[PDB]
């Protein structure tokens, strides 16, 4: 009675582009080209696929199968698999909140860059502004110039001292207060995501039509533009030049594994929630396969979109694309790439479509990001929740706004780096490992292959059974161990992070997964009798 069965999706293509839109984001555009160029060039294509075939694809498909088969959220699905692991469903939730504290503020920047691109004269071209220093030296200016250690460019001046305003903070110690502009921008973003989620999967499935198709159009325009630019072959050469001596280093394999894990994004509850709303007899194999292969191809062409323009930028300056692409961060897009766009005809156009591209790159992923959590919470507290969906969705959007105020500060970029590298990363890898272990070694891989045999009509191949059993947990274990054995030394904008930064990162990291061990102890501490009877009723799913 009442609710009973759940709803289902409108069309196959909507979910195929929703998952693709979540998989494709900023990192596909700029993280993959940089990490591909500096780690062997074209030879990085070899382990990126291997780490995909053996690590990424099995977790992606296994997550999409569990989601489309059991049709439960990120929390309630563990009650039906391994109750002690129900804390997993909570951990991811907390994780999302950290991600949402900064990933949206970033989009805000693009938005603030987009709404400022309606002027006939772009702000970051001249130096006669109210924010530039005496070091500001620009082009369309006397030739012969020679750059000095203290000299800066109008683009670097514009990002550093105007929008980000990072000069008003001394580091993590003193960063307050909050910039009201980026607060209003991130409010507009939380509003364009509000009307795309509040109705459920219907609006995030209608908005995905745009959020997932626009970046390919914008990338196409920037691609055919940058390919026509003189000297664009240098960036492509630096992008594809095979350096087989890099493959001997054990680092590039870990880089490929991590890159294909976060790019594929299993283990986050997004694929679980998106897969939950679907037909029972619908095929799952082809869906997962196609989606991932697009996510990689899209990264591949995005590489050209970046390196043609950076090649042109190296030609206008003096070569070694590594010199012009040293900084691996938002500065590669907001400073380097932006300064390169400013020096092209119809600059207003390529700026609007560039920043708009960024926003549409971010939107689909924040849509899904929220979709998984909302689905999980509504399914764990049903009829105590679902009374309205708009109420919960609003409480989440607003919570993320107040959670982003730390990122909206003058020293917000510092918090962005700290949260992106020291907090969320190792925890998502951890919970992905815990999920992969629970589903593969607790629920049983044989029963999983039988469930897929019931849904899809055929049992998965030996290649996939052997991947879920052994290949995937070692795939995540390698990345986790590699990070924990040597955490990278953080540096951002001529500011080295204090030595205690990792403790804060680990503090934020540890406060996220206190629920799985305290919940294992909680449920393990609640069920009476002997510990063998409690763990036997706790590992085996509910009988009826």
């Amino acid at each position: 009675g009442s609710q009973g069965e759940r709803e289902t999706w409108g069309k196959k293509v909507d979910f195929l582009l929703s998952v693709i839109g979540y998989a494709v984001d900023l990192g596909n555009v700029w993280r993959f080209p940089y990490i591909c160029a500096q780690n062997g060039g074209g030879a990085f294509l070899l382990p990126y696929t291997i780490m995909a075939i053996f690590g990424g694809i099995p977790l992606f498909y296994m997550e999409l199968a569990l989601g489309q088969y059991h049709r439960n959220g990120c929390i309630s699905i563990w009650r039906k698999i391994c109750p002690i692991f129900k804390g997993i469903g909570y951990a991811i939730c907390i994780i999302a909140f950290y991600i949402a504290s900064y990933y949206n503020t970033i989009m805000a920047w693009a938005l603030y860059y987009l709404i400022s691109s309606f002027t006939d004269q772009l702000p970051w071209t001249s130096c006669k502004n109210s924010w530039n220093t005496g070091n500001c030296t620009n082009y369309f200016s006397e030739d012969n110039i020679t750059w000095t250690l203290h000299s800066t460019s109008p683009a670097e001046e514009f990002y550093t001292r105007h929008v980000l305003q990072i000069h008003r903070s001394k580091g993590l110690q003193d960063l307050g207060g909050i910039s009201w502009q980026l607060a209003l921008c991130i409010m507009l973003i939380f509003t364009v995501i509000y009307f795309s989620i509040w109705k459920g999967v219907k609006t995030s499935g209608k908005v995905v039509w745009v959020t997932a198709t626009f970046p390919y159009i914008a990338l196409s325009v920037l691609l055919v533009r940058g390919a026509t630019l003189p000297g664009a072959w240098r960036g492509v050469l630096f992008y594809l030049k095979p350096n087989w001596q890099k493959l001997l280093e054990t680092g590039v394999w870990i880089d490929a594994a991590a890159q294909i894990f976060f790019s594929l994004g299993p283990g986050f509850g997004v694929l679980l929630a998106f897969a939950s709303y679907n037909k029972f007899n619908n095929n799952c194999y082809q869906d997962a396969l196609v989606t991932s292969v697009v996510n990689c191809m899209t990264s591949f062409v995005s590489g050209f979109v970046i390196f043609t323009v950076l090649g042109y930028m190296a030609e206008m300056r003096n070569e070694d694309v590594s010199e012009v692409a040293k900084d691996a961060g938002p500065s590669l897009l907001f400073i380097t790439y932006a300064e390169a766009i400013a020096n092209m005809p119809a600059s207003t156009f390529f700026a609007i479509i560039f920043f708009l591209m960024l926003i549409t790159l971010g939107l689909d992923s924040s849509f899904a990001g929220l979709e998984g959590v909302i689905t999980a919470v509504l399914d764990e507290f049903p009829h105590v929740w679902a009374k309205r969906r708009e109420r919960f969705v609003l409480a989440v959007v607003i919570t993320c706004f107040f959670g982003s105020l730390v990122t909206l500060t003058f020293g917000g970029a510092y918090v962005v780096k700290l949260l992106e590298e020291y907090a969320t990363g190792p925890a998502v890898l951890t919970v992905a490992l815990i999920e992969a272990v629970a589903v593969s070694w607790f629920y049983g891989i044989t029963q999983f292959c039988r469930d897929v045999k019931e849904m899809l009509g055929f049992s998965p191949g030996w290649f996939w059974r052997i991947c879920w059993v052994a290949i995937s947990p070692l795939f995540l274990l390698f990345i986790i161990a590699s990070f924990l054995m040597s955490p990278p030394q953080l540096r951002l904008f001529q500011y080295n992070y204090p030595y205690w930064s990792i403790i804060l990162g680990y503090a934020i990291g540890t406060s996220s997964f206190i629920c799985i061990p305290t919940y294992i102890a909680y449920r393990l501490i609640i069920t009476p009798g002997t510990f063998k009877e409690r763990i036997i009723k706790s590992i085996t799913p509910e009988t009826p």
Partner: antibody, heavy 119, light 108 residues
Framework: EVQLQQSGPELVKPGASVKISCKASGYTFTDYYMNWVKQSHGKSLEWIGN????????SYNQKFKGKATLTVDKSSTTAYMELRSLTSEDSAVYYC????????????WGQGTTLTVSS | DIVMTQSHKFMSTSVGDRVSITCKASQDVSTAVAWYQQKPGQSPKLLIYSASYRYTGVPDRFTGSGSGTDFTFTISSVQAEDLAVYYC?????????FGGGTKLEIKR
């Protein structure tokens, strides 16, 4: 104007270490990269590495990694290059040369330092 | 790395002749070539930067040309005090490398 005064000749026994100085004047010291070029007897110039004077931001060459150590002192605007594990190949004339960031040319050089590594 | 190759280790010219030194690079350089002068017993002296541009305090008789991998340093009117060893050096990719050196001997 721009003057770079290095140290005098140095005669050091093989296996020991030697430090060469570089006093700069005539320009804003925190504005330009400080470099070290090794020139062997009858050979060509050989870029050792640079150092950022604001923070000591060193950038060595792969051929001199672990061979030369560049330091800098802002209190007196003076750069240093130290060479350890001296052999017969290190007996050469060493220069410290000013250079901007871009374009990376060596506008002003020192007079050189004749190093002789022999017992 | 980059290999700057000067084929002619020695070149003979006379006082007043037109002399040109060639410099061959490994890969494409665009216009990132500097020409240095090292007089016998003195420190190197910068003459040309970015293929063709002359530096401040250099007579007009010293020129530079080239765009790509092969570059040429040309002296129109050779003076008696122009006797020195000339070096070419790329300034785009790390590390910055130099040429072998061309000792310009004067014929009389």
């Amino acid at each position: 104007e721009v003057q770079l005064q290095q140290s005098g000749p140095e005669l050091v026994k093989p296996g020991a270490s030697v430090k060469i100085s570089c006093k700069a004047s005539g320009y804003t010291f925190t504005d330009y990269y400080m470099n070290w070029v090794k020139q062997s007897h009858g050979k060509s110039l050989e870029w050792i590495g640079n150092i950022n004077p604001n923070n000591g931001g060193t950038s060595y060459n792969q051929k001199f990694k672990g061979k030369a150590t560049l330091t800098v002192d802002k209190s007196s605007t003076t750069a240093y290059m130290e060479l350890r594990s001296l052999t017969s190949e290190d007996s050469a004339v060493y220069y410290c040369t000013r250079s901007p960031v871009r374009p990376y040319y060596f506008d002003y050089w020192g007079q050189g330092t004749t190093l002789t590594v022999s017992s | 790395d980059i290999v700057m190759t000067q084929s002619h280790k020695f070149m003979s010219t006379s006082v007043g002749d037109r002399v040109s030194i060639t410099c061959k690079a490994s890969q494409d350089v665009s216009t990132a070539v500097a020409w240095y002068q090292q007089k016998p017993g003195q420190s190197p002296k910068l003459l040309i930067y970015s293929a063709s541009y002359r530096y401040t305090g250099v007579p007009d008789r010293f020129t530079g040309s080239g765009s790509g991998t092969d570059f040429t340093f040309t002296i129109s009117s050779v003076q008696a005090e122009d006797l020195a060893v000339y070096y070419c050096q790329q300034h785009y990719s790390i590390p910055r490398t130099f040429g072998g050196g061309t000792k310009l001997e004067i014929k009389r």
